[PDB]
Ligand binder design. Structure first.
Ligand SMILES: Nc1ncnc2c1ncn2[C@@H]1O[C@H](COP(=O)(O)OP(=O)(O)OP(=O)(O)O)[C@@H](O)[C@H]1O
Ligand SMILES: Nc1ncnc2c1ncn2[C@@H]1O[C@H](COP(=O)(O)OP(=O)(O)OP(=O)(O)O)[C@@H](O)[C@H]1O
Ligand SMILES: [Mg+2]
Ligand SMILES: [Mg+2]
Lengths: 127, 127
């Protein structure tokens, strides 16, 4: 895949660690561009900047060349903004965890489910 | 991924051609073992053998080393047998198309939906 969209919820009390190896492997296939996105509640400039900082800190966990990482912050519904960016990039692949790591009630979380169903590109659900 | 499960519906009047590049790429990441599975209605020996022959013919479309391809025929519910084999292999990845290529009513077909939700491993929905 050329353009890989990697949505990350920065509030994940516990980060979804298993996505790291998958993002790294998928990126190595074609030296993809890796686009990290976090969607926050909709001052806002300050909230956006702090969200971007947290997202870059998470991205430090990934072995991907610096030149290939790109960062995006959006506001509102996570599924809507994930899908809008997948369309506009456009993404060749979206890589999403099945749900938050500490919660097992739902086999797919609401955003994972929507994104796998509605994306126009391939979607890798990681567990 | 080490063991990749690739379920194929051999009756697909039109084969899902976009899965080829994805299976091939995913297999190249770690020289995975690639397990093709087709699930048929439940003489049966003859039906199983003919189904396996059709499945091997489809597999000829894929650029994967011969040593790494493996073939499986099961009987009954496709989602149940896909998930059973994913568990028993065990599969590190299941690669499935979103739906049949000629039918657009449902953004996810019934088997794609079940498998993405219920697999214990990562699942790549291809479109
Ligand atoms: N606010 C967000 N911004 C970016 N990506 C997100 C956001 N929320 C969820 N995601 C993406 O979707 C994945 C699955 O999260 P999801 O929210 O679907 O599960 P959950 O939190 O367990 O369920 P729910 O939010 O429905 O209670 C996350 O790992 C992440 O990739
Ligand atoms: N009988 C089968 N054996 C092996 N894999 C199958 C079978 N049926 C479906 N699949 C797998 O699931 C994928 C999606 O097919 P699915 O059956 O979910 O979609 P569909 O045929 O459009 O929907 P439906 O069967 O619900 O009308 C297929 O491309 C294939 O990977
Ligand atoms: Mg959530
Ligand atoms: Mg079907």
């Amino acid at each position: 895949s050329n353009a890989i969209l990697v949505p990350i919820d920065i509030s994940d009390k516990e980060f979804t660690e298993r996505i790291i190896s998958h993002v790294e492997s998928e990126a190595r296939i074609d030296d993809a561009e890796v686009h990290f996105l976090t969607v926050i509640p909709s001052g806002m400039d300050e909230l956006r900047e702090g969200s971007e900082t947290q997202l870059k800190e998470i991205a430090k966990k990934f072995s991907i060349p610096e030149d290939r990482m790109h960062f995006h912050v959006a506001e509102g519904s996570p599924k809507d903004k994930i899908l809008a960016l997948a369309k506009s990039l456009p993404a060749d692949l979206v890589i999403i965890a099945s749900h938050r790591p500490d919660i097992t009630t739902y086999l797919l979380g609401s955003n994972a489910a929507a994104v796998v169903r509605h994306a126009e590109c391939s979607v890798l659900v990681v567990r």
